Design a protein around this nucleic acid. Structure first.
Ligand code: MG
Ligand code: MG
Ligand code: MG
Ligand code: MG
Ligand code: MG
Ligand code: MG
Ligand code: MG
Ligand code: MG
Ligand code: MG
Ligand code: MG
Ligand code: MG
Ligand code: MG
Ligand code: MG
Ligand code: MG
Ligand code: MG
Ligand code: MG
Ligand code: MG
Ligand code: MG
Ligand code: MG
Ligand code: MG
Ligand code: MG
Ligand code: MG
Ligand code: MG
Ligand code: MG
Lengths: 133, 233, 187, 199
RNA sequence: GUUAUCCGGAAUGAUUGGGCGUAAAGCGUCUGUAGGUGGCUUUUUAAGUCCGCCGUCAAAUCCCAGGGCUCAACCCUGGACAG
């Protein structure tokens, strides 16, 4: 648990590859925000919170299998960019865009977390958390 | 259109139970329901929706004029299939299933050519002019060709709908229809994976009663669909 | 019920003999076959070297429909032919853009062959290496960048290219998946 | 620096080349030996495309190359921009206005100072023509005579809509920049570009 | 055309961009000093990070836009992204 962000991302990727809709993730401001964003983008069905023994679990419903489990044309990819060993930052004009914009990029900036779209409207650069296909 | 199903009849014929919990495929864990005495109990509220959709597409496909196969190779399911197929006037496989029946058509059809020559031979009465070795040999040809080509011997052309009993033992049928672009409407017990069929109906394996229930429902759908394709063309 | 002899001779006359009927039907399929590679493979027997030809061949309409196929025979011609059929039954479709290029940038992996495709500006032509280039050219992609990294083997690179252009998502469909209007993702 | 070799030959191998020869080739008489290379390597195809281009316009390779660099520089579709550049050449606009028999003739004309661009004498073939430009004959007897007899005795009226011609003084006028459909040959520029990826 | 020199192709020293069960490659196994990374919540600060404005990073070169030697190479004016 040296990195929480990468961990969330990873659990998602694993549950996804295994064709399961439901994931338990540990909550945190970052986690919660990231998931919110993930919802307003439409990458994930629904999110909700649970509590036991002062632990918080966000469970995430995931988009249903593609017209069977066997014949899948599409998966859902996640990639950590800035990680504890190398922190990647970008100014306004270097802000990444994924596959011509089909995917998104998550930024942590002065005004909070957002997508690259929001950064382009508001004109801010910052730290790039991950890429999402 | 409606079909005949209720919780009470499916409770009657014994559809709701399946093989022991040592033997199960967790791939089926989403739509299973309970577990009793180390005997699994499969969800019937899913079973009714799948059986409804199955009889619906069976009705549309019968009405448009498409051709039907049915398959199970078991001991009881074979005696049930000859009669299911005669009652719906369809093509069947009960006895030993030959690899390549669907996928390799050309050689299967030449095998049918020579089986037809054999059917003309035997009724012509020209098997009485032969040495004893020749009649015993032509009778080997006959015995075999009847076993394998018995229920399909009417069909000319590639069958576009296939119906199947218990996909565990039926692997090659599933493979061949997966390959050729054919839909499979299949019976699932707790041991089988729900990849291999287009419409997979949760069902029972060991029971002759479940086989008869779901197969009579389906052959009734094919029968009313047979009235609708006797009308539409 | 009409007699069995006349109706079974009707299914015998409708399915034609392979010894009395010659074959060229293929240009009516609207396809073109392009031979990528011709190799002489060998099985060895107590007598000596038993020689065969392996042909790797792709088919396309140059209209956005393409496939790969592999075949084996004693003669160049026959293997070519088998390759043709195996390809035709294996065939798929490449997502295209109004300018005849790719939706986006993509990688692919098949065996030790890795393949890099990225969209281009109109008028750049197709720049790539043998397998990837023939596949893409036969698909009809007009402007494409590609480089095979990893291995050089023709066949694997072909299959990898197919894997690439198969996973390509066109914008309409990501709009439909995400559940968001096109113009919102455009920005 | 100019191609003085046999034309008909390059015509046979490459294809139909307007800027070279008006005489249609012989039946070809290669049907005796029936000698072929088998088929053509992709490379040979691309090479013959480029060769087509180059020999139609009378250009040297090293020249074509720098044209191509100019092309890759310009912002827009590469092959198209290239074809523009090749088609705005002076001896070429001279030819395509029918002021000349062929491109070698037009080159000869330009070279001997028989032409004027905006009342200024330009004797170099590769002069690049720009919009709103006057193509005139020099006012001397011989210049007029050449331009007249080569203009009138050739019946073709194809003039590709960016080119104006006026009757008595014979004032040619370049109106605008070429359109890709108005180009002077049948070529997939894509192929020439693909050949030049390696320079 | 040949030879020499350098970069390329070479993902063949790999940040972008590789590997280490059997192909070259996991110290024989631990304890631990420097060193690197390090869970959650609230506040602070503002070193990084981000945005705006200013100074400068000479002219020539490269990039864009015109102009001049008949064209081009070359020359001249004006201007700027980077960083
Ligand atoms: Mg900086
Ligand atoms: Mg074989
Ligand atoms: Mg690998
Ligand atoms: Mg390489
Ligand atoms: Mg010579
Ligand atoms: Mg290069
Ligand atoms: Mg030299
Ligand atoms: Mg290097
Ligand atoms: Mg080395
Ligand atoms: Mg290596
Ligand atoms: Mg060894
Ligand atoms: Mg070793
Ligand atoms: Mg060890
Ligand atoms: Mg060792
Ligand atoms: Mg040691
Ligand atoms: Mg230690
Ligand atoms: Mg320490
Ligand atoms: Mg610290
Ligand atoms: Mg932290
Ligand atoms: Mg300077
Ligand atoms: Mg300039
Ligand atoms: Mg000038
Ligand atoms: Mg300057
Ligand atoms: Mg600065």
């Amino acid at each position: 648990g040296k990195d929480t962000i990468a961990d969330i991302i990873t659990c998602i990727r694993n549950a996804d590859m295994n064709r399961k809709g439901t994931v338990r993730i540990v909550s945190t401001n970052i986690t919660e925000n990231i998931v919110k964003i993930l919802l307003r983008e439409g990458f994930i069905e629904n999110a909700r919170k649970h509590q036991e023994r002062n632990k918080y679990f966000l469970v995430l419903t995931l988009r249903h299998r593609r017209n069977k489990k066997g014949p899948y044309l599409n998966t859902f990819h996640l990639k950590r960019v800035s990680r504890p060993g190398l922190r990647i930052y970008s100014n306004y004009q270097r802000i990444p865009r994924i596959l011509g914009g089909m995917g998104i990029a998550i930024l942590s900036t002065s005004r909070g977390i957002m997508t690259d779209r929001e950064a382009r409207l508001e004109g801010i650069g910052g730290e790039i958390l991950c890429y999402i296909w | 259109r409606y079909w005949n199903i209720n919780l009470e009849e499916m409770m009657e014929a014994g559809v709701h139970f399946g093989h022991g919990t040592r033997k199960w495929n967790p791939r089926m864990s989403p739509y299973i329901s309970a577990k009793c005495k180390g005997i699994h109990i499969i969800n019937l509220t899913r079973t009714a929706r799948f059986l409804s959709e199955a009889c619906d597409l069976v009705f549309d496909a019968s009405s448009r004029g498409k051709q039907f196969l049915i398959v199970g190779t078991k001991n009881k399911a074979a005696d049930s299939v000859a009669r299911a197929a005669i009652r719906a006037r369809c093509h069947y496989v009960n006895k030993k299933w030959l690899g390549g029946m669907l996928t390799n058509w050309s050689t299967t059809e030449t095998r049918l050519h020579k089986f037809r020559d054999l059917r003309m031979e035997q009724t012509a009465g020209r098997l009485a002019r032969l040495p004893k070795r020749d009649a015993a040999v032509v009778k080997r040809q006959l015995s075999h060709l009847q076993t394998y080509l018995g229920g399909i011997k009417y069909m000319t052309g590639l069958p576009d709908i296939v119906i199947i009993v218990d996909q565990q033992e039926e692997y090659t049928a599933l493979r061949e229809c997966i390959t050729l672009g054919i839909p499979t409407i299949c019976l699932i017990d707790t041991n089988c994976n729900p990849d291999l069929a287009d419409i997979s109906i949760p069902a029972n394996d060991d029971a002759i009663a479940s086989i008869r229930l779901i197969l009579t429902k389906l052959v009734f759908a094919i029968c009313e669909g047979r009235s609708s394709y006797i009308r539409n063309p | 019920l009409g007699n069995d002899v006349y109706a079974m001779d009707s299914k015998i006359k409708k399915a034609t003999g392979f010894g009395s009927k010659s074959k060229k039907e293929k240009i009516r399929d609207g396809f073109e076959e392009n031979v990528v590679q011709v190799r002489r493979v060998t099985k060895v027997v107590k007598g000596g070297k038993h020689m065969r030809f392996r042909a790797i061949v792709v088919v396309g309409d140059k209209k956005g429909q393409v496939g790969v196929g592999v075949g084996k025979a004693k003669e160049v011609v026959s293997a070519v032919q088998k390759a043709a059929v195996d390809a035709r039954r294996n065939i798929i479709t490449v997502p295209m853009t109004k300018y005849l290029t790719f939706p986006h940038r993509n990688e692919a992996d098949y065996g030790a062959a890795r393949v890099m495709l990225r969209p281009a500006a109109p008028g750049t032509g197709v720049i790539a290496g043998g397998a990837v280039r023939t596949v893409l050219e036969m698909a009809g992609v007009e402007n494409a960048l590609g480089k095979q990294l990893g291995s050089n083997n023709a066949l694997n690179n072909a299959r990898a290219t197919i894997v690439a252009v198969q996973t390509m998502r066109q914008f309409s469909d990501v709009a439909r998946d995400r559940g968001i209007p096109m113009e919102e993702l455009w920005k | 620096s100019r191609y003085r070799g046999p034309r008909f030959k390059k015509i046979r191998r490459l294809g139909a080349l307007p800027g070279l020869t008006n005489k249609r080739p012989r039946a070809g008489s290669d049907l005796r030996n029936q000698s072929r290379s088998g088929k053509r390597s992709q490379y040979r195809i691309r090479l013959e495309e480029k060769q087509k281009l180059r020999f139609h316009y009378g250009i040297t390779e090293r020249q074509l190359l720098k044209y191509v660099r100019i092309a890759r520089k310009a912002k827009g579709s590469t092959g198209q921009v290239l074809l523009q550049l090749l088609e705005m050449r002076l001896d070429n606009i001279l030819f395509r206005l029918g002021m000349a028999p062929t491109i070698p003739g037009a080159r000869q004309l330009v070279n001997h100072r028989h032409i004027l661009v905006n009342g200024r004498i330009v004797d170099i073939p590769s002069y690049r023509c720009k919009p709103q430009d006057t193509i005139m004959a020099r006012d001397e007897q011989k210049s007029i005579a050449l331009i007249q007899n080569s203009l009138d005795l050739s019946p073709r009226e194809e003039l590709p809509k960016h080119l104006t011609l006026n009757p008595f003084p014979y004032k040619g006028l370049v109106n605008q920049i070429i359109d890709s459909k108005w180009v002077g040959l049948k070529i997939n520029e894509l192929l020439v570009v693909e050949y030049y990826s390696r320079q």
